[PDB]
Amino acid sequence: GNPAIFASGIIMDSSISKQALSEIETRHSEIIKLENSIRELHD
C-alpha cells in the first residue's frame, strides 16, 4: 500500500525549572547550617 513514510519532528521537554531550582536552593541551604551545628557539637 502506502510506501514507507518518514517520521515527524521531535519536540523534547526540559525538566528542571528556575523556580523549582529556587526550591532546591531552599533544600540545600539548611544543610550547611545543620553542618555548622554538628561541627560545633563534635568540637
Binding site: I16, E23, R27
Partner: peptide, 22 residues
C-alpha cells in the same frame, strides 16, 4: 519518618541523602 527531602526529580541521589539523615 516518611522522608526528609522533597522529591523534585527523585533519582537515586535523593534516596541516599535522606537515608543518611535518618
Amino acid at each position: 519518618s516518611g522522608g526528609f527531602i522533597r522529591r523534585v526529580t527523585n533519582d537515586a541521589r535523593e534516596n541516599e541523602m535522606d537515608e543518611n539523615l535518618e
